[PDB]
């Protein structure tokens, strides 16, 4: 018995014994009606280690616990550069909105205080629809989790004062349907420095502890105390080659004036994950810079028909 946890739902599947990661993943995506499968994965945690279900491996053969309800979390593994230009289906847009809002509220990704207020105002518009002073009276947001605790702890303001500031901006969002408000939330969130960045502990050749960030834009090297501003960045289209051999990675820039960057990473399983994230992020970087495939063109036409079908019922 396999339990699948999405950002807003829990499903149970009667998984076959001789089934591989691909079979379970495809079933989940079909059940959800999700066609942009390339962004997503099935994640699990064992003995303090985050891992993804391998598509070419048997589900039961994985290092996951042999607990009665074998559980995976369906989550986005890859992120678009501009969600407003790339995410086609409403289901995909909504799952990204939920996941990213959770990363902001639980402080997985940093957010300046002013952005947390503006983001909360779009989350309120998405959840409640248009602000209406007859309905949304003072105290209507008292039970909502609106801001990261880090932000609340930086100011001498009451919950009512935070609600008032959020409500001012919520009132400015009149006219945004749920999908429009959730997409405006993603448009703000996707410009945060930590958005979509996968961090890994590495060392340079002199032993200096650093972090590698793998993201939709390229590769980035950080001092461990500052995950916001890379010391050096290598955009995907500026990398000539990435080599890996015996725990050592080498990033070779296309620009000869930029030095080759070598670093080490201690865990083989993590190194395989770093390489997988490099290959697929580089592939997605190239794909979004070329004209839509016929499959994407048709997916957009179908999403347009679905949006117009739902709009006819409301009007």
């Amino acid at each position: 018995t396999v339990r699948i946890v999405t950002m807003d739902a829990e499903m149970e599947f009667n998984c076959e014994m001789k089934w591989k990661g691909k079979d379970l993943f495809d079933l989940v995506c079909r059940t959800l009606g999700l066609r942009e499968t390339w962004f997503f994965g099935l994640q699990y945690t064992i003995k303090d280690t985050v891992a993804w279900l391998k598509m070419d491996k048997k589900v039961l053969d994985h290092d996951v616990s042999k607990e009665e309800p074998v559980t995976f979390h369906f989550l986005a593994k890859f992120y678009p550069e501009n969600a407003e230009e790339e995410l086609v289906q409403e289901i995909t847009q909504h799952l990204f909105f939920l996941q990213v809002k959770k990363q902001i509220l639980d402080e997985k990704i940093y957010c300046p205080p002013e952005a947390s207020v503006l983001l909360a105002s779009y989350a309120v518009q998405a959840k409640y629809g248009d602000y209406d002073p007859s309905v949304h009276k003072r105290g209507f947001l008292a039970q909502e989790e609106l801001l990261p605790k880090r932000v609340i702890n930086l100011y001498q303001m009451t919950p009512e004062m935070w609600e008032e500031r959020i409500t001012v901006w919520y009132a400015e969002h009149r006219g945004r349907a749920r999908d429009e408000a959730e997409m405006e939330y993603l448009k703000i969130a996707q410009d945060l420095e930590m958005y979509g960045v996968n961090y890994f502990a590495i060392r340079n050749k002199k032993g200096t502890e650093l972090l590698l960030g793998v993201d939709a834009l390229g590769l980035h090297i950080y001092d461990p105390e500052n995950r916001l501003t890379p010391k050096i960045s290598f955009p995907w289209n500026e990398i000539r080659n990435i080599s890996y051999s015996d725990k050592e990675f080498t990033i070779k820039p296309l620009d000869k004036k930029i030095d080759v960057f070598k670093f080490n990473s201690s865990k083989l399983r993590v190194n395989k994950l770093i390489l997988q994230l490099c290959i697929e992020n580089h592939d997605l970087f190239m794909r979004r810079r070329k004209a839509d495939s016929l499959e994407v063109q048709q997916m957009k036409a179908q999403a347009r028909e679905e949006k117009a079908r739902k709009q006819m019922e409301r009007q």
Binding site: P112, P113, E114, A115, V117, L118, N153, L154, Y155, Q156, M157, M161, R165, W169, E172, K187, I188, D191
Partner: peptide, 23 residues
């Protein structure tokens, strides 16, 4: 630019919060 068309609102929010900073 960072935060696209929301710079004006972000700066106004920054100004509204400033008097209450813990420091």
């Amino acid at each position: 630019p960072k935060f696209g068309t929301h710079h004006k609102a972000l700066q106004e929010i920054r100004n509204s919060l400033l008097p209450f900073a813990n420091e």
